[PDB]
Design a protein around this ligand. Structure first.
Ligand code: MG
Ligand code: MG
Ligand code: MG
Ligand code: MG
Ligand code: MG
Ligand code: MG
Ligand code: MG
Ligand code: MG
Ligand code: MG
Ligand code: MG
Ligand code: MG
Ligand code: MG
Ligand code: MG
Ligand code: MG
Ligand code: MG
Ligand code: MG
Ligand code: MG
Ligand code: MG
Ligand code: MG
Ligand code: MG
Ligand code: MG
Ligand code: MG
Lengths: 348, 147, 125, 118, 52, 180
RNA sequence: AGUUCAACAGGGCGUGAAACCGUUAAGAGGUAAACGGGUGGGGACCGCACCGUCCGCCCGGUGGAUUCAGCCCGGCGGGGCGGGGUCGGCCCGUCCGGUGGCUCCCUUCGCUCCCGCGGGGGGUUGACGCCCGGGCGAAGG
RNA sequence: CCGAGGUCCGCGGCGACGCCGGCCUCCCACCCGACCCGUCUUGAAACACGGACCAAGGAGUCCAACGCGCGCGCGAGUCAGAGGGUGGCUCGCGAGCCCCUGCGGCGCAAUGAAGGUGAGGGUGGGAUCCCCCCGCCCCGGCGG
RNA sequence: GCUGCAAGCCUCGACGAGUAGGAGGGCCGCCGCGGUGGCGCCGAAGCCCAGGGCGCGGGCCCGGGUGGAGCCGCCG
């Protein structure tokens, strides 16, 4: 929460340009994969069109069951005639060409609404995951050579108007390897999804968040995988694809400044969103090894019992000798006085 | 969803979780709330007493805007003003007292449920309770009315 | 390429659990389905009938999924999914998938020989 | 906060391979390619990476630096040890033991050196 | 029909309600239809206020 | 065979938090280490409540927390509660509380901090007080939900005082035959 | 014979399952056939030294080779709350120093501006932006 | 070593696709066991019903509302719904983001047919925690 | 030395019938979508098999034949 370093703003050509921007508190918001997944599966459900079987299907015929009296199976059969259709099952779901069981109506609940606070919570946890090297590399993005995980670039990139100026920047920031992955991923979809305008499928690329659209959207259009989004309007479905957090976002300097005003630090609430602030943490020190091995907890735990106790196999004390004197030390004395009793010695 | 459904684990079982002796049929006990006096009387007289019969007078044209009378208690009375206002007049009890207009806050009647802090206060409400004004006079303050 | 150790892989039953009355009908496949009839002999486990798979037939936890050679099987599709078996090559053996081509199948066999990884189907094309 | 990040990579990861009742991880800084909080390579602040050299000769000991935490380009240091079998194992052993850098992966790293040298 | 403690439900679904069901699938497209009508009206009364 | 009934062999006790929360399961990994090695009866009670559901972890208002701290013998102890510390708007003063809970509402967090108080979390509690010394473990009104007003003998029995399930509380709704 | 990568694509012609049937190969057959458990015989396809119990660590001699090792000099790089190690900035939270103006709490007072009510200046903070070589947190880079 | 469950620092004949190995599957033989499934039924191998065989299709669904349990967000509040504002858009985007002098819904007060009226701690048990005394101590705790 | 996938590993003791019904687990299976990791004319899906195997089981993997263009693993 209070661990916010100073993020540098890399130039449009090479390394840092001397501009440093404080890390917004949004990147320190609680990372909640269970919130982002819950919101994603309800938001991605909100853009789909309804499908339905025609209500007239199956009932286009006039059929009355022949009933009891003949070897037929007592099912609605088509009226008499000279066709093959006459005498066949018409209405039941078991019958060929008949109605389906529970025809899919077009008024089912396609859309699900999420709480506005949970949509923002899922957005803060999705932005906080875009600031850790682990969650982004494990998301799938190849950023093993980028200069810094929060990739803040100068506002000059907002004025780009040609794709050659945009592809060169991604090669300078070593982010082109994340796009070469998109080219190698372009393939053909499996199954009957190719007949429904979803033939070619590919992978995702580095998202780019800007502030002013002076040509940024059209300069990064033709690059496969690039997703451009305004800083004020961030869609969770593109910043957390498939419900998984860790989208490699390329930030602009202008978008990084306003990012602290959209959601606000914990000290002062936001301004562009009335009555909103970042969610609090229910766990400040999220490092278990620092708490367990601390100077104050080791004084309260017992020494570790690292001696496993195997099952002691039970030998018969009556048959065995060394385990009888282990349970009864007198057994050796009582046995010697009995073995010696079988010795024919003469007394007084 | 359907993967978490119960029918997905009933494939193979014949009766589909509805018994073999008494098979699942179509309305074996009447539709809806039928038989509330004949064969479901033990259910209606045990969980819904008073369901059958009439009680009270009939109000033909009832307009809920006429009986509108939202109430407020004395414990939440100081919620209608800022927390700083409650303290700026708590230190100077020498006569300057804040005026709490309960009518302009969305309420009509004031009830004396909770305890009131010992500070002079003027309240403006359309209706007061007997104990509501007794606790305000005892703490210090007036109970003015508003039409 | 010997494994780390070859224990006595004891199996409580080597036969398959055949479905009831799957020898009298072609529609009844041999895939096991629990009989749930009210008067079924197999369900009531009469004497001399077909056996039902219980949890008692469970193999030893140390020898489960263990091939007769002593290794455990792991399906690979390329040389990248093969180098994960570099460590613990005494306990896991690679197995090239069936959809790979004979061109790339030879590359996995050559790379597995360097890393001392055993392949169950070395010469498959 | 490694323990916080492991609760997101333990089941949902791009490097996770689940098949044949086995689970492997394919991150570059994993010694035994095992999915565990001990061997995971892109989560901790001190990770040991051992890879073969550019050619067939040598061993590259990749170590994670201290200042390179949020900077992946300046986060790893390459150490190429093209020596005999004993000298390579002795150099890597002194890097881990005498620097106290990830001292729990000492023997696991020594067994990976002898595995890539063959 | 009742089994244990519960409410006495009165779902008014005894008519042929399935023939009279209005689905709000044109709700977002109706916002665009209303908005483009306000912009078209605005240009028609350009010097005059658009609210009325 | 042996003559024993297997009806109640399984003890139905939640041994793992049913929530997929990340920060909550990290506190479970912390207090499971203390419930085994600290040998303190406090950590064994916090571990149970980290598993319990939301209905078994009711809120704890400020007033209900202040009154339990003003009892004789609670001078400089901490008010531990596994749940949310909601604000009680009908109370006036806050007597320098030192609380520790999972969540604290925005107004309750402001009134506690403005009074000079201190708000902790269960990871800081296990750091400063591993044995649980100097703590006062509190709880909320578990039987305070509206759901428990319907639980009883039956609405239509003598001496019931059980709230019946009705659509709307009115005059023509279950008041005619059996309620007079 | 010919065309085609292919006629295991020859015209209701891609792929060509099951039921059923023909034929070939193998075996058997009086108490209908099948089935469970146990073993034996046979068959069809498969696997298995060439010293695969001479693999590996260490050790001791024999015999061919070592851009040959400890040690030392120079450069580079990295680790180091139980290295604090002495000097230093920087970010965030918090509390003071309120250090001086803008919102001020509906803060007390003076006041065009229509018939008592809505407007424009000065004096008073649990609040922002600044400053402290001012603290404090195993809060950080 | 009659001791926290086994080892041999014992050994023999064969080892070229054959004289070795597979026992699960294929065919056949023998011994023991063994009546046909589904279903209703107190009771089915039944002289109870359905089933000649094979393939494909074939039956617990969706909507409204309610109850309890659980996950999540905020919390005496909560939900922004109709609608409005738009990157001037909008290819993905009939999504998403933003705010409505939050109208209103459900809660924050009940009771009476109604006019109406309207809410001030004790005892017992009790997880947990606090304090005191006496011993031991590896000085952190332990025992009474 | 070995693990620490803590939703993991290890130790000990008792126990195991079951229709109607209830619950849990599934790295059992089918179609489609958002992520992700691949495979394919050096031969995909499907289909066939006296071939080699895994799981108590649902089923699955590999080899051979046939086929000629798409298909699959994991997290949701
Ligand atoms: Mg009709
Ligand atoms: Mg007939
Ligand atoms: Mg049809
Ligand atoms: Mg398909
Ligand atoms: Mg059953
Ligand atoms: Mg039935
Ligand atoms: Mg019934
Ligand atoms: Mg009956
Ligand atoms: Mg019904
Ligand atoms: Mg088997
Ligand atoms: Mg029976
Ligand atoms: Mg019933
Ligand atoms: Mg009953
Ligand atoms: Mg054909
Ligand atoms: Mg029947
Ligand atoms: Mg009957
Ligand atoms: Mg008979
Ligand atoms: Mg018949
Ligand atoms: Mg079918
Ligand atoms: Mg019920
Ligand atoms: Mg059982
Ligand atoms: Mg379908």
């Amino acid at each position: 929460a209070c661990a916010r370093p100073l993020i540098s703003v890399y130039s449009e050509k090479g390394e840092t340009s001397g501009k440093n921007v404080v890390m917004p508190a949004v990147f320190r918001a609680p990372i909640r994969p269970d919130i982002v997944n819950f919101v994603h599966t309800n938001m991605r459900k909100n853009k789909r069109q309804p499908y339905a079987v025609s209500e007239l299907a199956g009932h286009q015929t006039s059929a009355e069951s022949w009933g009891t009296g003949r070897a037929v199976a007592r099912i609605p059969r088509v009226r008499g005639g000279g066709t093959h259709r006459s005498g066949q099952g018409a209405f039941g779901n078991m019958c060929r060409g008949g109605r389906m069981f529970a025809p899919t109506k077009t008024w089912r609940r396609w859309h699900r609404r999420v709480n506005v606070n949970q949509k923002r919570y899922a957005m803060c946890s999705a932005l906080a995951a875009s600031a850790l090297p682990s969650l982004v590399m494990a998301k799938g993005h190849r950023i093993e050579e980028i200069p810094e995980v929060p990739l803040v670039v100068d506002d000059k990139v907002e004025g780009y108007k040609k794709t050659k100026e945009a592809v060169l920047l991604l090669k300078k920031l070593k982010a082109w390897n994340d796009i070469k992955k998109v080219y190698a991923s372009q393939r053909m979809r499996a199954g009957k999804g190719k007949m429904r305008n979803r033939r070619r499928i590919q992978r995702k690329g580095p998202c780019i968040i800007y502030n002013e659209d002076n040509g940024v959207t059209r300069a990064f259009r033709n690059i496969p995988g690039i997703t451009l989004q305004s800083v004020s309007r961030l869609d969770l479905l593109k910043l957390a694809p498939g419900g998984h957090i860790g989208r490699f976002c390329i930030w602009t300097e202008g978008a990084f400044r306003k990012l602290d005003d959209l959601y606000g630090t914990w000290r002062k609430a936001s301004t562009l969103k009335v009555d909103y602030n970042l969610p609090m943490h229910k766990m400040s020190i999220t490092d278990l090894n620092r708490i367990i091995k601390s100077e104050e907890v080791q004084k309260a735990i017992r020494p570790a019992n690292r001696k496993i106790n195997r099952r002691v196999f039970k030998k018969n004390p009556l048959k065995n000798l060394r385990v009888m004197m282990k349970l009864n030390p007198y057994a050796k004395t009582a046995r010697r006085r009995a073995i010696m009793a079988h010795n024919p010695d003469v007394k007084a | 969803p359907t993967k978490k459904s119960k029918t997905r684990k009933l494939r193979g079982h014949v009766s589909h979780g509805h018994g073999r002796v008494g098979k699942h049929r179509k309305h074996p006990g009447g539709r809806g709330n039928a038989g509330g006096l004949h064969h479901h009387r033990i259910n209606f007289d045990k969980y819904h007493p008073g369901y059958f019969g009439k009680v009270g007078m009939r109000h033909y044209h009832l307009k809920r805007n006429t009986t509108f009378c939202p109430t407020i208690n004395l414990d939440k009375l100081w919620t209608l003003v800022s927390e700083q206002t409650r303290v700026n007049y708590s230190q100077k009890p020498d006569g300057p007292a804040p005026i709490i207009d309960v009518v302009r806050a969305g309420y009509f009647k004031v009830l004396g449920k909770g305890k009131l802090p010992k500070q002079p206060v003027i309240v403006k409400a359309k209706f007061f309770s007997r104990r509501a004004e007794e606790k305000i006079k005892g703490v210090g303050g007036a109970c003015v009315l508003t039409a | 390429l010997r494994p780390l150790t070859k224990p006595k892989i004891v199996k409580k039953r080597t036969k398959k659990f055949i479905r009831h009355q799957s020898d009298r009908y072609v529609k009844i496949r041999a895939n096991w389905r629990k009989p749930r009839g009210i008067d079924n002999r197999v369900r009531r486990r009469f004497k001399g009938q077909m056996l039902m798979p219980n949890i008692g037939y469970g193999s030893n936890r140390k020898t489960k999924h263990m091939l007769p050679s002593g290794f455990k099987k792991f399906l690979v599709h390329n040389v990248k999914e093969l180098e994960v078996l570099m460590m613990s090559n005494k306990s896991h053996c690679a197995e090239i998938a069936h959809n790979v081509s004979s061109k790339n199948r030879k590359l996995i066999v050559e790379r597995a020989a360097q890393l001392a990884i055993k392949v169950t189907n070395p010469n498959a094309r | 906060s490694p323990h916080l990040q492991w609760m997101v990579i333990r089941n949902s990861s791009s490097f996770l391979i689940k098949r044949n009742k086995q689970t492997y991880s394919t991150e570059p800084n994993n010694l035994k390619a095992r999915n565990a909080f001990r061997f995971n390579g892109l989560i901790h602040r001190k990770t040991i990476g051992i890879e073969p050299a550019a050619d067939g000769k040598g061993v590259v000991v990749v170590l994670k630096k201290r200042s390179g935490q949020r900077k992946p380009a300046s986060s790893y240091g390459k150490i190429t040890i093209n020596k005999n079998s004993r000298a390579t194992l002795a150099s890597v052993r002194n890097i881990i033991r005498k620097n106290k850098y990830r001292r729990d992966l000492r023997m696991a790293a020594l067994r990976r050196v002898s595995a890539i040298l063959s | 029909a009742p089994s244990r403690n519960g409410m006495i439900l009165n779902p008014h679904f005894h008519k042929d309600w399935q023939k009279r069901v209005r689905t709000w699938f044109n709700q977002p497209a109706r916002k665009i239809r209303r908005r483009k009508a306000r912009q078209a009206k605005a240009r028609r009364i350009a010097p005059r206020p658009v609210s009325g | 065979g042996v003559d024993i009934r297997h009806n109640k062999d399984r003890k139905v006790h939640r041994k793992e938090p049913k929530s997929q929360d990340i920060y909550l399961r990290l506190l479970v990994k912390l207090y499971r280490f203390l419930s085994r090695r600290s040998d303190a009866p406090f950590n064994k009670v916090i571990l149970r409540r980290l598993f319990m559901s939301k209905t078994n972890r009711p809120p704890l208002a400020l007033s209900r927390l202040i009154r339990k701290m003003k009892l004789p013998g609670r001078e400089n102890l901490t008010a531990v509660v596994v749940g949310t510390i909601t604000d009680d708007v009908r109370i006036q003063n806050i007597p320098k509380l030192k609380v520790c809970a999972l969540k604290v509402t925005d107004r309750a967090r402001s009134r506690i901090l403005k009074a000079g108080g201190q708000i902790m979390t269960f990871d800081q509690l296990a750091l400063t007080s591993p044995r649980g010394r100097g703590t006062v473990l509190l709880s909320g009104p578990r039987k305070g939900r509206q759901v428990y007003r319907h639980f009883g003998k039956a609405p239509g029995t003598p001496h019931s005082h059980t709230k019946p399930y009705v659509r709307s509380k009115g005059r023509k709704f279950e008041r005619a035959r059996g309620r007079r």
